[PDB]
Amino acid sequence: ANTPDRLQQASLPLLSNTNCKKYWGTKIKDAMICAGASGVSSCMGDSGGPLVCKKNGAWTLVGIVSWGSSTCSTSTPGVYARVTALVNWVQQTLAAN
Amino acid sequence: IVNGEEAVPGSWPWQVSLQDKTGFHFCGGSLINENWVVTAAHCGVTTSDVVVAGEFDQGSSSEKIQKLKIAKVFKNSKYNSLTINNDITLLKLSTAASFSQTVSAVCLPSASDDFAAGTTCVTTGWGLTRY
Amino acid sequence: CGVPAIQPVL
Amino acid sequence: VSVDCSEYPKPACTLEYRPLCGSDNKTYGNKCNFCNAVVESNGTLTLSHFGKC
C-alpha cells in the first residue's frame, strides 16, 4: 500500500484562518485551524491524530487531524479541529465523568 | 502523511492507533491522561473499538504495546456532520494506560492561548504516505 | 505532560 | 449496504481510513475517495466490498 507500518511525522506551519479561507473559503469555521501547504499533507488514516506545537518546552495539542484535500495535495493546507476552541468542553467533560 | 519521515520509535508517546474489532487501524488519537483519549468525532469510534498505545511499527509480531478497551465515547454535541465543525470526541478508557518511557500524555492548551501563524508545529500518524 | 522520555528527531 | 454518492464530487475529504474495494479491484481509502471515483467513472464503478481488495 501507501499505508505505513512505521509511525510518520512532519513539521509544518500554522496558517491564519484568513489565509486558510484563501484556499477553502467559507468552509473554514471558528473551530478549525489550518497548517501545511508547505510540501506535506496529512492523508487517509491520519484523522484524529495530533497537531502539536511546543509551548514552554512542552508539546501541546493545538489541533486534531480533521479534513483536507481529497487528493492529499501538498500545496493545500490540512484542516484540524482547533483545540483552544474545544478545551472548555474537554475539561468540563473530564470533570463530570 | 504525504512527504513525512519515520519518527524515532517512542518519541511521540501520546500517539495512539484506533483499531476495529478485527485489528485494522482506522484513525489516530492522543492520550491526554492515563484514562482519556481525544480523537475526531468523524472517526465514529465505538466501544467495540480498541486503542493501541505504545505502538511504532504496526507491521510487528509484537513490541510492548497496550491494547486498551473503551468504556464510553463522548462525542461533542455541536459536531456537525455537514460542516465537520466541532470535530472532537473523547474516549474514556475501561482500564487506565500504564505510563512508561513510550506511553505518556500530551498537554492541553488553555482556551486563552495563542499559537501564531507561521509557527512550526508537528503532525503524526499512520495515514497513507501517498495518494 | 508533553516531554517525551525519548526525544523526537525532526 | 448501499453507498450513495449523490453529493459528489467533493474537493475535500475527512481523513479516516475505512477502505472500500471497487469493481476496478482498487482500494479507496474511505467513502469520500470512493464516491469521487464513482462520479468520475460515469457510473461504471461499483462497490465490490468493504475493506482492502
Side-chain angles (χ1 to χ4, degrees):
Chain A
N2 355 32
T3 148
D5 272 343
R6 303 191 233 7
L7 176 66
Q8 317 278 305
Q9 89 193 0
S11 30
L12 79 186
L14 294 195
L15 276 68
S16 54
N17 266 207
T18 52
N19 285 300
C20 200
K21 316 183 178 215
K22 311 252 72 81
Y23 297 77
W24 290 122
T26 61
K27 282 148 114 88
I28 315 289
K29 327 272 189 218
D30 280 14
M32 291 159 197
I33 191 143
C34 311
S38 54
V40 297
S41 190
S42 277
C43 201
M44 275 90 60
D46 284 325
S47 251
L51 174 83
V52 300
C53 311
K54 246 181 227 185
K55 228 232 111 231
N56 293 347
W59 292 106
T60 310
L61 189 75
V62 183
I64 306 179
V65 180
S66 188
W67 59 272
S69 133
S70 74
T71 46
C72 294
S73 173
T74 68
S75 2
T76 337
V79 190
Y80 301 72
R82 196 193 279 267
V83 175
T84 68
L86 310 162
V87 86
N88 290 333
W89 169 87
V90 172
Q91 311 285 2
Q92 272 233 60
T93 295
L94 271 46
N97 304 273
Chain B
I1 293 157
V2 172
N3 277 147
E5 49 193 1
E6 215 188 82
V8 177
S11 51
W12 300 121
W14 44 85
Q15 176 79 50
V16 300
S17 166
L18 299 178
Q19 297 172 19
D20 71 7
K21 233 338 120 32
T22 62
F24 289 92
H25 165 101
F26 59 92
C27 273
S30 291
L31 283 168
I32 56 174
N33 357 320
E34 40 260 290
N35 306 273
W36 290 86
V37 160
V38 73
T39 199
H42 84 257
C43 281
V45 171
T46 67
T47 61
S48 295
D49 303 309
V50 319
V51 163
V52 182
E55 194 153 57
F56 165 74
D57 170 342
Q58 278 203 351
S60 267
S61 251
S62 218
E63 9 185 68
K64 307 174 223 132
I65 72 164
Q66 299 167 59
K67 281 167 140 55
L68 300 172
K69 279 275 251 291
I70 299 167
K72 170 103 165 78
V73 170
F74 299 80
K75 168 153 113 197
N76 193 302
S77 36
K78 285 316 221 247
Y79 173 57
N80 176 323
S81 36
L82 287 24
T83 75
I84 319 315
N85 206 21
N86 293 310
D87 186 26
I88 189 168
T89 275
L90 267 178
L91 311 184
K92 174 152 221 281
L93 291 187
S94 161
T95 293
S98 266
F99 286 1
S100 47
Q101 197 113 325
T102 69
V103 177
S104 51
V106 67
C107 300
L108 277 189
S110 130
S112 303
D113 272 58
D114 211 277
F115 299 92
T119 308
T120 304
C121 298
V122 168
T123 196
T124 49
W126 292 269
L128 310 177
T129 60
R130 194 54 304 189
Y131 182 89
Chain C
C1 55
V3 202
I6 309 185
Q7 242 74 32
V9 182
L10 301 164
Chain D
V1 172
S2 256
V3 182
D4 153 56
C5 303
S6 265
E7 330 101 87
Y8 292 80
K10 292 179 168 176
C13 289
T14 53
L15 312 157
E16 74 279 19
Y17 186 69
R18 306 217 103 145
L20 300 74
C21 182
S23 44
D24 40 7
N25 206 222
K26 272 151 112 168
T27 309
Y28 293 96
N30 67 30
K31 58 139 232 155
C32 177
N33 181 20
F34 172 76
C35 277
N36 277 330
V38 162
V39 304
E40 188 182 328
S41 76
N42 194 25
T44 196
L45 172 74
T46 59
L47 180 59
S48 165
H49 57 88
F50 297 71
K52 284 154 214 172
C53 301

